[PDB]
Scaffold this active site. Sequence first.
Site, PDB file in Angstrom:
ATOM      1  N   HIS A   1      12.632  -0.720 -63.273  1.00 24.39           N
ATOM      2  CA  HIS A   1      12.576  -0.667 -61.826  1.00 24.39           C
ATOM      3  C   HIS A   1      13.938  -0.393 -61.210  1.00 24.39           C
ATOM      4  O   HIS A   1      14.894  -0.950 -61.627  1.00 24.39           O
ATOM      5  CB  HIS A   1      12.052  -1.974 -61.287  1.00 24.39           C
TER       6      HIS A   1
ATOM      7  N   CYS B   1       6.342 -17.694 -29.000  1.00 28.51           N
ATOM      8  CA  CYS B   1       5.768 -18.996 -29.352  1.00 28.51           C
ATOM      9  C   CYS B   1       4.864 -18.845 -30.560  1.00 28.51           C
ATOM     10  O   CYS B   1       4.703 -17.743 -31.085  1.00 28.51           O
ATOM     11  CB  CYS B   1       4.966 -19.601 -28.191  1.00 28.51           C
ATOM     12  N   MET B   2       4.261 -19.946 -30.994  1.00 27.37           N
ATOM     13  CA  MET B   2       3.366 -19.876 -32.142  1.00 27.37           C
ATOM     14  C   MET B   2       2.218 -18.883 -31.920  1.00 27.37           C
ATOM     15  O   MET B   2       1.837 -18.169 -32.854  1.00 27.37           O
ATOM     16  CB  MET B   2       2.796 -21.261 -32.482  1.00 27.37           C
TER      17      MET B   2
ATOM     18  N   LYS C   1       0.044  -4.932 -54.468  1.00 27.64           N
ATOM     19  CA  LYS C   1       0.493  -6.292 -54.392  1.00 27.64           C
ATOM     20  C   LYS C   1       0.645  -6.763 -52.968  1.00 27.64           C
ATOM     21  O   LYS C   1       0.617  -5.999 -52.089  1.00 27.64           O
ATOM     22  CB  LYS C   1       1.784  -6.483 -55.146  1.00 27.64           C
TER      23      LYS C   1
HETATM   24  C1  LIG Z   1       7.168  -3.352 -55.466  1.00 29.79           C
HETATM   25  C2  LIG Z   1       7.165  -2.587 -56.724  1.00 29.79           C
HETATM   26  C3  LIG Z   1       6.813  -1.174 -56.800  1.00 29.79           C
HETATM   27  C4  LIG Z   1       6.530  -0.416 -55.522  1.00 29.79           C
HETATM   28  O1  LIG Z   1       7.717  -0.281 -54.762  1.00 29.79           O
HETATM   29  P1  LIG Z   1       7.731   0.503 -53.387  1.00 29.79           P
HETATM   30  O2  LIG Z   1       9.066   0.622 -52.934  1.00 29.79           O
HETATM   31  O3  LIG Z   1       6.905  -0.284 -52.553  1.00 29.79           O
HETATM   32  O4  LIG Z   1       7.169   1.777 -53.607  1.00 29.79           O
HETATM   33  C5  LIG Z   1       6.845  -0.574 -58.034  1.00 29.79           C
HETATM   34  N1  LIG Z   1       7.122  -1.226 -59.140  1.00 29.79           N
HETATM   35  C6  LIG Z   1       7.442  -2.505 -59.188  1.00 29.79           C
HETATM   36  C7  LIG Z   1       7.769  -3.226 -60.454  1.00 29.79           C
HETATM   37  C8  LIG Z   1       7.485  -3.275 -57.964  1.00 29.79           C
HETATM   38  O5  LIG Z   1       7.808  -4.547 -57.959  1.00 29.79           O
END
Ligand SMILES: *Cc1c(COP(=O)(O)O)cnc(C)c1O
Lengths: 368, 368
Positions: B169, B316-317, B41
């Site tokens: 998670h 700066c930018m 991601k």
């Molecule tokens: C971001 C994410 C991961 C990976 O997490 P890390 O700490 O980067 O390893 C795994 N599962 C879900 C649902 C996430 O959003």
Amino acid sequence: MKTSSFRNTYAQISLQALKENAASFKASLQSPACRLMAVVKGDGYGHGAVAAASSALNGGADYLGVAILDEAIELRDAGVEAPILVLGYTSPHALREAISRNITLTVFSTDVRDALLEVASEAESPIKVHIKTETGMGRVGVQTKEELLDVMTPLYHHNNIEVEGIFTHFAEADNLQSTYTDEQFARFLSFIEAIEKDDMHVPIKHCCNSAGTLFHKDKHLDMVRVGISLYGLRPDVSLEFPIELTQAMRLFSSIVSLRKLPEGSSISYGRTHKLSSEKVVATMPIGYADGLSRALSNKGFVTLHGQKAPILGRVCMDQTMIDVTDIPDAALGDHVEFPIDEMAELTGTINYEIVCAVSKRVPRYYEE
Amino acid sequence: MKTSSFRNTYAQISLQALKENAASFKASLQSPACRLMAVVKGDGYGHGAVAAASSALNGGADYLGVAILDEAIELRDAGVEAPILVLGYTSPHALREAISRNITLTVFSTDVRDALLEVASEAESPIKVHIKTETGMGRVGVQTKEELLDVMTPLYHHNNIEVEGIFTHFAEADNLQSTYTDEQFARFLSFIEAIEKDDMHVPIKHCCNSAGTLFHKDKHLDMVRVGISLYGLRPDVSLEFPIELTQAMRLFSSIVSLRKLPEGSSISYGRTHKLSSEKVVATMPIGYADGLSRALSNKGFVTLHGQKAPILGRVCMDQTMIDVTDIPDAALGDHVEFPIDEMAELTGTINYEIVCAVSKRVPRYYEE
Ligand SMILES: *Cc1c(COP(=O)(O)O)cnc(C)c1O
Ligand SMILES: *Cc1c(COP(=O)(O)O)cnc(C)c1O
């Protein structure tokens, strides 16, 4: 530029605002001979370089400014034919590419001067350059009359080079209690006096940024370089605009989850926020990989239904939680807005950074 | 992905590091049946989604994870054929597009459940979904056994839907002094017990992120989801890696101006730094529109010639100034390196944000 998405997180960009802002600036200039340069570096300050350039030209801009050659080439590849000045450094190895795409170059050093003298001897139409002078920003530019003369004179007298411009940049033209801008201006004119004593005439002398353009009309000279306020954003939030301008970017996300969580529940990474009572928590599909600053963790807010909803706990890469307990009509699917200047203030930065940080994952919707 | 530039500001990405990191993680898993999901991601955490995915698969990854459907479609359009799970929300209007590109979807709400039941009524081969459960991150997911059963049961028994996965998670698996990860795990297993009492068997149960994968091997279950440490970055800089990993991204700029400035000179916007003596100031073609945090103003540093050169005044930018007075061999053209973890520490953030913030203006150079 990403311009579509299956996710309701987006930056709405008003092209009419950009066009009208350029027209408003053009009308405000000290003299009708004064050129309006639209500064579209940083991909049009996060609005989109091609969209911003096109809109600004339609509103009366005379010149475009970018930070680096890559940005100038991007505009040319999109079919923009207006004059473009690279405001920053361009290295010797890049000069032939720049001249082949009719890009005006800033020069302030001998490496580039000497390469240009060799390259110019082998080009069709004259190469255009602007010389950068140092007057107090402490960034780039020749520093003394002697250095200015050493850098500029061989370019000026090369039969296939035009020294079209000479410029400087202000460190605090937005500080209306400071003498520094007048001091920089005096040093700039002192550089100009030196080249004119050597009978070198430069047709575009320029020094103003947005703040200089708005508040120092005596310094408009031949061209002004308007960046942040072209987008309807203030150089400093303490200032009030003296001309009519409209903020062009608005940043939105939406509610993709709406849940009641009990007292004591912790929200997001590190459990940095624990609910002091039962709350209705909304989750948005936006996070710091979209450019939403993680420094807004536990301190920023969004607006919806005429109210502020504070961010709870840490901003994640792609998701952020807000408290909508006091907003009874909050619902799954509601769109919410992020206040750009307030996000800057809350995280100790400036609107410039906030809008540039909106990442490539966020689509820009040009609503006109 | 931008992969070339005329400016020497760039992110060097080691594909070999990514491949070897995936292999190192795969070797470390509790059982050989356990799947390695490479989480790519945020455009591969700023490294490039396609590059990161390709490398990770070559190193033994079994599944890819993205945040949003846009990212999954991008991978498919680049010719990636591996399984992809969208980890976040996908809206009802996007489901047909997702299923047509063979993308596995996360589901945790009735709007999506009901749309899926109508749509699946279509489709060539079965649709694959994973159910998200809430166990303490306070972000998304079904909250109770009853809600899990209500959301999952109609999907499980639809003849053209496969509930391939169920997951949660962790909020602080990187906190090795906390009981919270074990508490979350127990709640996760409690959800699983509820669906198995109703005779619903789900082939891929998963809960671990990088920190869970590294430090909670008892929780590997059927699949782990490795993001930050796939890139050789620590979940928290207080931790030491228990397996062999290499940081994949290195960020560089260069000196495009080298000047001596007198005592009392101010550097950059707002004159926030004034030289306490004569200094040699180098200017770099990098600023916050490249993703260099403006919070590094007057506090960050770069490395060159084995020394640290502090940033002077405001970023700066597009340009940033550094003090190289104590680095006698600093020269125009020198390349300099930005320390990723230290930039995070100095600005009160985490390496995740630093690497995602590297903007689209910065080319990625794939070293192998
Ligand atoms: C971001 C994410 C991961 C990976 O997490 P890390 O700490 O980067 O390893 C795994 N599962 C879900 C649902 C996430 O959003
Ligand atoms: C950024 C910049 C501008 C525009 O400044 P704003 O404050 O955005 O108006 C003008 N000139 C130069 C050289 C710049 O770098």
